[PDB]
Amino acid sequence: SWEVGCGAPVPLVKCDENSPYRTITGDCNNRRSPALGAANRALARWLPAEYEDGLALPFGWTQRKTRNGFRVPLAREVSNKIVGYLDEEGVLDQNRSLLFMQWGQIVDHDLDFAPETELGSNEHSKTQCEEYCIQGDNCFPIMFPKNDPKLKTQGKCMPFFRAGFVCPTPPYQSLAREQINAVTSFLDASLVYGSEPSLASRLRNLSSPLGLMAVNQEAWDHGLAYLPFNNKKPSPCEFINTTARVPCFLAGDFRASEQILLATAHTLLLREHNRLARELKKLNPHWNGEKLYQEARKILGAFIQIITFRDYLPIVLGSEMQKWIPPYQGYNNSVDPRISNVFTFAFRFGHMEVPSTVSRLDENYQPWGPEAELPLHTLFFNTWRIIKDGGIDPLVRGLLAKKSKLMNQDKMVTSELRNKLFQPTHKIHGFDLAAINLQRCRDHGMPGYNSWRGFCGLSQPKTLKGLQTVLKNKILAKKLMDLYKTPDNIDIWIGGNAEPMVERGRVGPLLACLLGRQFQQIRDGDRFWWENPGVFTEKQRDSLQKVSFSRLICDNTHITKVPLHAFQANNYPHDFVDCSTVDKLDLSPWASREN
Numbered sequence: 386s387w388e389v390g391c392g393a394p395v396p397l398v399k400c401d402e403n404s405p406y407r408t409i410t411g412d413c414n415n416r417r418s419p420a421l422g423a424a425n426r427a428l429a430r431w432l433p434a435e436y437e438d439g440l441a442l443p444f445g446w447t448q449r450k451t452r453n454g455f456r457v458p459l460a461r462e463v464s465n466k467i468v469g470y471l472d473e474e475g476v477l478d479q480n481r482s483l484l485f486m487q488w489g490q491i492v493d494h495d496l497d498f499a500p501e502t503e504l505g506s507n508e509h510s511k512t513q514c515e516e517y518c519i520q521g522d523n524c525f526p527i528m529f530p531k532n533d534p535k536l537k538t539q540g541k542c543m544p545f546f547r548a549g550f551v552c553p554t555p556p557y558q559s560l561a562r563e564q565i566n567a568v569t570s571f572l573d574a575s576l577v578y579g580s581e582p583s584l585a586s587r588l589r590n591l592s593s594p595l596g597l598m599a600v601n602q603e604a605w606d607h608g609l610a611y612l613p614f615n616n617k618k619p620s621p622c623e624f625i626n627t628t629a630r631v632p633c634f635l636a637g638d639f640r641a642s643e644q645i646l647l648a649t650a651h652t653l654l655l656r657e658h659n660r661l662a663r664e665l666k667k668l669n670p671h672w673n674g675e676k677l678y679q680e681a682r683k684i685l686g687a688f689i690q691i692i693t694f695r696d697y698l699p700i701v702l703g704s705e706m707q708k709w710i711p712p713y714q715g716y717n718n719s720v721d722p723r724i725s726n727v728f729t730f731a732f733r734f735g736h737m738e739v740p741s742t743v744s745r746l747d748e749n750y751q752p753w754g755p756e757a758e759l760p761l762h763t764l765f766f767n768t769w770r771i772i773k774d775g776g777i778d779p780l781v782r783g784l785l786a787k788k789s790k791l792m793n794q795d796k797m798v799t800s801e802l803r804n805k806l807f808q809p810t811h812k813i814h815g816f817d818l819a820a821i822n823l824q825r826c827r828d829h830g831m832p833g834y835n836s837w838r839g840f841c842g843l844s845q846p847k848t849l850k851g852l853q854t855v856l857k858n859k860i861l862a863k864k865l866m867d868l869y870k871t872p873d874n875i876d877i878w879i880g881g882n883a884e885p886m887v888e889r890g891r892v893g894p895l896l897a898c899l900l901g902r903q904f905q906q907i908r909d910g911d912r913f914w915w916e917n918p919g920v921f922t923e924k925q926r927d928s929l930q931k932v933s934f935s936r937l938i939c940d941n942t943h944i945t946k947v948p949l950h951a952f953q954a955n956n957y958p959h960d961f962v963d964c965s966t967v968d969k970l971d972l973s974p975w976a977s978r979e980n
């Protein structure tokens with residue numbers, strides 16, 4: 386029982402032992418088990434998968450088959466009855482900058498990516514799912530319910546294609562289906578450098594011995610760099626404006642261009658790497674290219690790790706931070722550093738923090754131009770608003786001065802995402818991220834809400850009155866019972882996000898526990914954790930201790946007025962200071978005298 390491993394996908398396993406740098410694929414991090422945490426391997430299962438047929442079919446596939454004796458409600462109905470809301474007033478988080486939401490997506494894209502299966506190169510089946518809404522194989526359409534407005538203007542469904550899974554790609558059946566994580570489980574800046582050697586290399590500027598990352602040769606941000614373009618067709622960034630004809634960017638991670646602020650954040654990171662390669666050159670003229678690239682890579686990965694664990698997680702978890710992530714004790718080679726399947730859903734809480742508009746601010750932090758504020762849906766895969774309309778400085782100001790959307794039980798996901806999401810190769814700004822999250826949760830064979838409450842050592846409500854007490858909300862509990870007919874069937878994504886927020890944090894107790902464990906594990910289980918003895922020098926470590934997101938902005942834009950604490954709500958000019966009164970990153974301890 387339980388033979389140890391299917392392993393047709395990741396075959397090659399060769400580990401240079403001495404190495405001072407992480408591999409791109411994440412392999413060799415764990416010396417006892419070298420493939421743990423590498424990209425392109427199955428997501429970890431913290432609990433056995435739950436499928437309608439116990440093997441691969443998701444719940445909601447066969448009409449007559451129930452879950453625990455009940456039909457599961459359509460993803461879109463749960464979306465319409467619980468997730469939507471009209472009034473965008475008073476929905477803003479008075480105490481989290483918009484940078485808060487953005488950093489979450491960034492970290493998230495470093496950690497996991499379960500892309501759709503691909504049997505659609507020169508195919509009809511791409512359209513057979515779009516055109517006629519016929520379920521079968523990897524096509525698992527999100528049907529609209531009886532009273533849905535999209536029925537009137539969009540057809541019968543919203544297309545959806547099941548997520549990639551390991552050994553095969555169309556058929557297989559003996560063990561439960563396990564989805565693939567295409568990025569490294571380590572918080573290693575794989576989103577800047579890539580998780581594949583093919584991409585990692587392409588991203589590099591291999592024309593000179595400076596260990597720099599390739600930059601855009603066709604457009605400049607007033608002297609500063611832009612991410613190179615991804616010359617590939619069909620490009621969705623060109624699709625949203627065929628006049629501007631501006632391609633999507635090429636980053637270590639596929640999704641970089643999905644929305645303009647992520648693209649922005651990716652730009653800052655790329656610049657910081659290069660800035661780091663240049664200062665290291667000055668101090669170490671002898672270091673070759675590779676060394677420069679790697680030493681810069683290594684520094685940027687630490688940066689991402691510090692900001693995430695010192696600044697970000699404490700304000701996501703609040704009071705629960707300590708219960709799950711106690712002070713670092715060092716590298717424990719016994720810990721599973723893989724990202725769990727459920728984490729990829731639990732981290733989607735960030736979806737309720739996305740606001741309906743985005744702004745561009747000038748040097749006085751006032752409306753940049755006559756259309757400074759734009760609706761969120763006009764920015765999906767929009768790279769021209771950056772290239773042909775002000776570079777990233779105006780947007781980075783918005784990220785600092787604007788607020789994230791506070792999650793709210795009566796106002797969960799803004800319609801910009803819930804009704805107007807754009808998906809590549811599909812042609813309308815008419816998709817629903819909430820519905821997709823739900824369908825996806827079933828596609829991954831996720832256990833119900835209570836299995837996870839049980840997993841986290843929390844009560845498992847079984848009645849209306851039961852759920853009200855946990856959700857601390859009668860009306861929401863009723864709507865959920867009416868739809869699910871048992872809390873045992875509530876999809877973990879929505880059940881987890883419906884819980885009230887723990888003191889000082891921005892997620893409920895279930896999620897705090899799920900997020901808490903995962904982050905504790907990617908930290909304790911990482912051999913290259915920045916604070917782990919032997920990775921950096923004692924002196925380099927005191928220099929790193931000084932990074933701030935503020936500093937990153939000062940060093941990589943033309944902004945000189947920034948707050949001290951980037952993730953909290955900050956107003957200009959009061960909460961802002963001059964970049965000069967801000968700790969820089971002293972790179973002296975990287976100088977290497979050996980003569």
Ligand code: HEM
Nearest residue numbers: 486489490493497498499644729732733735736739821825
């Ligand atoms: C405007 C901002 C955002 C947009 C437009 C967006 C859109 C999307 C879309 C289209 C997907 C894939 C759906 C699927 O195929 O299952 C996705 C997935 C996801 N999002 Fe977002 N998202 C945004 C922000 C965020 C934020 C702020 C966070 C975290 C705090 C986040 C966390 C995730 C996670 C974990 C996934 C699952 C990734 C995987 O496949 O492993 N997202 N998002």
Ligand SMILES: *[C@@H]1O[C@H](CO)[C@@H](O[C@@H]2O[C@H](CO)[C@@H](O[C@H]3O[C@H](CO)[C@@H](O)[C@H](O)[C@@H]3O)[C@H](O)[C@H]2NC(C)=O)[C@H](O)[C@H]1NC(C)=O
Nearest residue numbers: 625626627628629630631754755763767769770772773774
């Ligand atoms: C698609 O992208 C087009 C290319 O940028 C964009 O057109 C550009 O955007 C506006 C639209 O008129 C113009 O900017 C405005 O502001 C400047 C201030 O300097 C003034 O010249 C005018 O008031 C002007 O309207 C750009 O001039 C314009 N450029 C071109 C070549 O058309 C479109 O608006 C975008 N279309 C969509 C559907 O997104």
Ligand SMILES: *[C@@H]1O[C@H](CO)[C@@H](O[C@@H]2O[C@H](CO)[C@@H](O)[C@H](O)[C@H]2NC(C)=O)[C@H](O)[C@H]1NC(C)=O
Nearest residue numbers: 589590591592593595597598599600601602613
């Ligand atoms: C790779 O780096 C090289 C060397 O820095 C780049 O070539 C230079 O680009 C500058 C602009 O910064 C131009 O003035 C010169 O043509 C080059 N200068 C030097 C000193 O070499 C090149 O653009 C980079 N290539 C890519 C694809 O990013």
Ligand SMILES: *[C@@H]1O[C@H](CO)[C@@H](O)[C@H](O)[C@H]1NC(C)=O
Nearest residue numbers: 479480481699700952953954
């Ligand atoms: C805002 O959040 C921060 C934590 O990021 C905390 O120090 C503070 O108590 C909050 N401020 C207000 C005014 O609510």
Ligand SMILES: *[C@@H]1O[C@H](CO)[C@@H](O)[C@H](O)[C@H]1NC(C)=O
Nearest residue numbers: 714716717718719720721909
């Ligand atoms: C190392 O990890 C294992 C599994 O998580 C745990 O049982 C053990 O207590 C850990 N030891 C230390 C010193 O962290």
Ligand SMILES: CC(=O)Nc1ccc(O)cc1
Nearest residue numbers: 639640641642643644809
């Ligand atoms: C680019 C793309 O495939 N879409 C996309 C997927 C996930 C996500 O979090 C943001 C965007």
Ligand SMILES: [Ca+2]
Nearest residue numbers: 495569571575
């Ligand atoms: Ca990673």
